[PDB]
């Protein structure tokens, strides 16, 4: 109880994890400029 | 006679405490899972 808030026990927890994983993608696509503009 | 008594009543009274030590045994088995956590945080933040 006096170590609740350590890292010591809450850092990993290999057998249930406390994290997702989320993936971004940043992009533009260029479409009939001169070759007005998009 | 009165001492065969003694003995059998006494017999008794430590088999029940006999029983009562394997709760007292499974609480070990909570350190011992607490204390291999702490070894994970352990080697995880060495590697860090």
């Known amino acids: 109880e006096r ?3 350590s890292q ?10 406390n994290v997702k994983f989320l993936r971004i993608f940043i992009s533009n ?3 009939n ?6 | 006679f009165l001492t065969n008594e003694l003995i ?6 430590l088999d029940a405490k006999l029983n009562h030590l394997k709760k ?3 609480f070990m088995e909570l350190e011992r899972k607490t204390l291999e956590r702490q070894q994970e945080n352990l080697l ?3 590697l860090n």
């Open chain 1, 29 to 31: 696509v260029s479409e």
């Open chain 1, 8 to 17: 010591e026990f809450l850092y990993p927890h290999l057998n249930f994890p």
């Open chain 2, 8 to 13: 059998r009543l006494q017999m008794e009274k």
């Open chain 2, 24 to 26: 007292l045994e499974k």
């Open chain 2, 44 to 46: 995880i933040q060495r």
């Open chain 1, 3 to 5: 170590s609740k808030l």
């Open chain 1, 33 to 38: 400029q001169p070759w007005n503009a998009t």
